[PDB]
Design a protein around this nucleic acid. Structure first.
Ligand SMILES: [Zn+2]
Ligand SMILES: [Zn+2]
Ligand SMILES: [Zn+2]
Ligand SMILES: [Zn+2]
Ligand SMILES: [Zn+2]
Ligand SMILES: [Zn+2]
Ligand SMILES: [Zn+2]
Ligand SMILES: [Zn+2]
Lengths: 149, 151, 150, 148
DNA sequence: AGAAGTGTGATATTATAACATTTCATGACTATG
DNA sequence: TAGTCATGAAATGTTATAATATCACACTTCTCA
């Protein structure tokens, strides 16, 4: 039902803006929401084919592009996968991604200090950065407890 | 004054000798070919370069080489792209790094940052997250492309 | 003994006479092509291929098709963007006329050497160097006519 | 010479009580100004300088119209479209000779092929509604280029 | 033996180019009549 | 008083390939008993 609430919320946001949250996009969103965290496009496509048997890569990639242009999903560059954002209605934001290499779970946190260090490092050199990519690989708490036995 | 490109290669050879791992002609050629780049490079571009010498070369060659070089820490993979760059900091003990990437000219700078590792560990510590490795990659413009914008 | 077996055997023999690799994947794709009434799209064929190779993706079927095209086991139907099995692997490269029913979708392949000759002559009048002909007819087949008559 | 055929088109689109919009006319104009085959999306790119709000349905509808009248032919084996040789003649059947190098397309008549196709269809129970006849190779020019 | 390396063809994975249609809301001609 | 025709705008469907990466086998080479 958190999924329901999430979808409703997304519908509300997309209703606010002049943008169309289609059944397809909504479906993809639902699927990704039900997923714990990260997922590749093609596994997601395989999931999508349950409800839309004719679905092909452009379908899911289009849905993702849409959900990416809006603030609903993030790409995970170091795994070629995608995940939901933990907070929707906010604008283009830099967030730090903690990715479990075991379960695929992703925790999204703020890291102003990092942005700042990079902001200064870009300035002590001649760099004008537009965007930071901050992805951490490791193990989440559960998977940590599991890997210790 | 930072370490020269050639010193890194010599250092690579001797380090591989110290570890009893084989820095073969191929892996060496790949290493130098990468070292000549003014920034990151893709596997197939590198493959194309490698062909002028070894035309019989295929992707497995390049990817094997890259896997080896990555394992020995001479090369970094740039994850936001899908490219590979020489490490200009492997003469010291293994390190954390942030890659600064120009979207246009494509050049990249590896710059150390303990202050990032610490914050990441701190953020990872509050949650129960056993951090292992960091990917820090910055996109924007370097102060060559910047002075082309100002015209 | 069955047509499919015989066919795959022929193919296996030809792909041996020629020093070429008829892999399980290619064999499976060909097997599937042989079991079709007529023409099939690359993606329908992919969907069929996924029943045996669940990981299969578009480059898979397109590679298999490119191979089967190179070796002359399948023809591409350009006007419908589809593929059919060749009726006779025995012949070398050949100019084939395709009769395509816009109702049932079935496709019949016919020989027409005359056409090759005419096109060659016509191309030879000008300075055109002919490589391949594309000859496809659209209409209704006998069955669809019988049906439509009522 | 473009204006000539443009006018002729209207003249013929008078006799046949169908409406040739500036849309379809513009498409036909662009098709004419092109000295060879063209894809729908390139044509769409060209149609946009005139009508920047143009989109694929626009050009496709246009092409469907221009196709159904006899002004343009579809080249099935290249998924492209070409202007007719001359559309003063009755609804003919084109045999398209296509250069795989330069992309030049030469429309010719091959009534013999059609005849044969009809006989073959006739010996079957096949009701032949339309034939597609296309050749791929090298135009004379490209041959002479490759000769060197 | 045995572990590591290479050559080669084919396959697997991720993403997009390229080509064509659907939908549905909106306006613009027209056949009664 | 509607009827078809034409368009406008977004999304979707459909076909095919680009771009990235690995597998699987065979042959080998150089080392280890
Ligand atoms: Zn977020
Ligand atoms: Zn975990
Ligand atoms: Zn480094
Ligand atoms: Zn730059
Ligand atoms: Zn045949
Ligand atoms: Zn039929
Ligand atoms: Zn014509
Ligand atoms: Zn030519």
């Amino acid at each position: 039902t958190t999924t329901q609430e999430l979808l409703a919320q997304a519908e509300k946001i997309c209703a606010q803006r002049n943008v169309r949250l289609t059944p397809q996009r909504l479906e993809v969103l639902r699927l990704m929401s039900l997923q714990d965290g990260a997922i590749s496009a093609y596994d997601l496509l395989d999931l999508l084919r349950e409800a839309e048997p004719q679905a092909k890569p452009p379908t899911v990639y289009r849905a993702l592009d849409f959900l990416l242009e809006q603030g609903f999903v993030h790409k995970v560059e170091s795994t070629n996968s995608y995940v939901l954002c933990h907070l929707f209605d906010q604008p283009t934001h830099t967030s730090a991604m903690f990715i479990c290499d075991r379960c695929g779970a992703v925790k999204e946190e703020c890291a102003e200090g990092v942005e700042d260090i990079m902001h200064t490092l870009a300035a002590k050199m001649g760099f004008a950065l537009r965007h930071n990519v901050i992805e951490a690989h490791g193990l989440c708490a559960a998977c940590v407890e599991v890997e210790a036995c």
